[PDB]
Symmetry: C2
Subunit: 99 residues, 2 copies
């Protein structure tokens, strides 16, 4: 595929919260691996809170974690294509629901 201007679509298509989308987009822009404690300083939230978002994004295969702090998180190298496809499928499922 901008990703910032598609916050609505993204939030709905994946059914995620505002914190989730905040965490995701931030990781996309820093273009580098990051810890849970760093993110927490960025959004001023508890590690646990932050980690809940990360978990949610990892299950969606948008974020990848890696052991060695303790864990590091990074965005999929092909993240933009994954979202493009995920939004196209969401639109198709939505058209079906509008039947």
């Amino acid at each position: 595929m901008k990703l910032e201007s598609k916050k609505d679509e993204i939030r709905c298509c994946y059914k995620i919260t505002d914190t989730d989308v905040a965490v995701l987009l931030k990781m996309v822009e820093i273009e580098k691996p990051i810890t849970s404690e760093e993110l927490a300083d960025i959004f001023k939230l508890s590690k646990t809170t932050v980690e809940n978002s990360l978990k949610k994004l990892i299950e969606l295969g948008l974020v990848v974690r890696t052991k060695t702090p303790k864990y590091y998180y990074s965005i999929s190298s092909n993240i933009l294509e994954k979202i493009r496809n995920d939004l196209l499928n969401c639109a198709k499922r939505m058209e079906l629901a509008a039947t």
Copy 2:
């Protein structure tokens, strides 16, 4: 779409109109009862204040989903073409999403 099927699409509806969970529950409850209702009756059902309820009603009215009728009463009811309106609104929502995938 269908009458009792609206509840199953509550997430799409809420996200697409960008309304709250209260807004949607009010909408679905009105669809289910199939008769006009006062903001006072709705306040009792959800145990919310008259003002919170009317703020939801005002939004559903601006969305064209609900009709307000002055009768010293004020009754609210579902739009006659709610099923076609929601269908078309979701299709447009899905379209904006498809166009967002470009």
